[PDB]
């Protein structure tokens, strides 16, 4: 009856870059409120196949 | 395999996407597949031209 | 805007997903995967 799936999220400062191999550090988080409202429009899935 | 390191400022900025339209340059055209079931690699039987 | 700091938090956030829509969504995905 909760009707809400909740995910636990973290904000990180040191991340792997998507544009190439390497790491980068970003400055620490904003002290006020952060709000994001997004539409999940698709999924990226892979398969686990194999002989067994 | 050594490392190249850049140190620079991190100002915070507002960051939110704007839909971007790609457009053909003069001499070119873009064909669009209008099938609602197009699977990504087959033939498309309903094709329109856009810039 | 109600966070603290931890040391020896601020880096803590959550996301809410409609349960009903998510489960319905998977059921439809599954139907297509089942056909395949």
């Amino acid at each position, epitope marked *: 009856g909760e009707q809400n799936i909740t995910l636990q999220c973290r904000i990180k400062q*040191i991340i792997n870059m998507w544009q190439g191999v390497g790491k980068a550090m970003y400055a620490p988080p904003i002290r006020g409120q952060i709000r994001c409202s997004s539409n999940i429009t698709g999924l990226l899935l892979t398969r686990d196949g194999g002989r067994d | 395999c050594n*490392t190249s390191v850049i140190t*620079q400022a991190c100002p915070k900025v507002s960051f939110e996407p704007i839909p971007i339209h790609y457009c053909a340059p003069a001499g070119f055209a873009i064909l669009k597949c209008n099938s609602k079931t197009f699977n990504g690699s087959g033939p498309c039987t309903n094709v329109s031209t856009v810039q | 805007n109600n966070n603290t700091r931890k040391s020896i938090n601020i*880096r803590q956030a959550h996301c809410n997903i409609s349960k009903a829509r998510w489960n319905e969504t998977l059921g439809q995905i599954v139907a297509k995967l089942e056909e395949q």
Partner: antibody, heavy 127, light 110 residues
Framework: QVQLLESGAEVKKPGSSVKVSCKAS????????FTWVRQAPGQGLEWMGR????????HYAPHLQGRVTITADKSTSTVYLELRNLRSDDTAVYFC?????????????????????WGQGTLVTVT | ELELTQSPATLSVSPGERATLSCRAS??????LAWYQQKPGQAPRLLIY???TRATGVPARFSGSGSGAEFTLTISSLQSEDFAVYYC???????????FGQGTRLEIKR
């Protein structure tokens, strides 16, 4: 939660380099950032530089950029300082200091310069 | 690098009195200063984290605040234990080029 243990004292002829080190113990090495301070007699806490242990990078005060290297050995939890082209102006008690970076191992590094953990001081002089 | 100027050293404050210490930056600091206590032969222990947070193990007696380039430190009910030189440090520097001032020593009038 880290204790910093300084190495022994040194006396060097001008033009030589000195290697000074600190052993960090009691917690994960990688979660602490480290700095070096030069307590020259009659002076304040001159900052020499800082090393980041996840991204193995370091930054130095401008007047020492061609003179000081700060490095670390992740397997022995040891912070190292090498200062070259020594002058009598460099007579000082040198030491390590550092801070705890929350879950730095997982990418949550805070990047604090507010030093909490300090060594006892290594005296380096010239002759 | 950014210079930090303090009040004159050797502030004679009798034990039990409230001491006032201060620090002026050549440039603005976004509540990014720190205060440290140095005694001869001792580590320069952190007392205040940022402009106003007490560092671990720091008594209520030792506190302060500030903004911009003007910061103030006070010591309530000054103890014989507090007669040390207090250093001002600035961190709003990237790439790091952190600086310290000279600090002010407290003294007992004789």
């Amino acid at each position: 939660q880290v204790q910093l243990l300084e190495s022994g004292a040194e006396v060097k002829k001008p033009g030589s380099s000195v290697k000074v080190s600190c052993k960090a113990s009691g917690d994960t090495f990688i979660r602490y950032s480290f700095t070096w301070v030069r307590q020259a007699p009659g002076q304040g806490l001159e900052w020499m530089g800082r090393i980041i242990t996840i991204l193995d990078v370091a930054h130095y005060a401008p007047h020492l950029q061609g003179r000081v290297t700060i490095t670390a050995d992740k397997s022995t939890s040891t912070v190292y300082l090498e200062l070259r082209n020594l002058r009598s102006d460099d007579t000082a008690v040198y030491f390590c200091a550092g801070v705890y970076e929350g879950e730095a191992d997982e990418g949550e590094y805070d990047n604090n310069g507010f030093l909490k953990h300090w060594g006892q001081g290594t005296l380096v002089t010239v002759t | 690098e950014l210079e930090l100027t303090q009040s004159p050293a050797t502030l004679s404050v009798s034990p039990g009195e409230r001491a006032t210490l201060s620090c002026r930056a050549s440039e603005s600091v976004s509540s990014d200063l720190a205060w440290y206590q140095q005694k001869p032969g001792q580590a320069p222990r952190l007392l205040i984290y940022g402009a106003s947070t007490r560092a671990t193990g720091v008594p209520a007696r030792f506190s302060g605040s500030g903004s911009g380039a003007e910061f103030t430190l006070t010591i309530s009910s000054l103890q014989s234990e507090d007669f040390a030189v207090y250093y001002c440090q600035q961190y709003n520097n990237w790439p790091p080029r952190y600086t310290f001032g000279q600090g002010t020593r407290l003294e007992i009038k004789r």
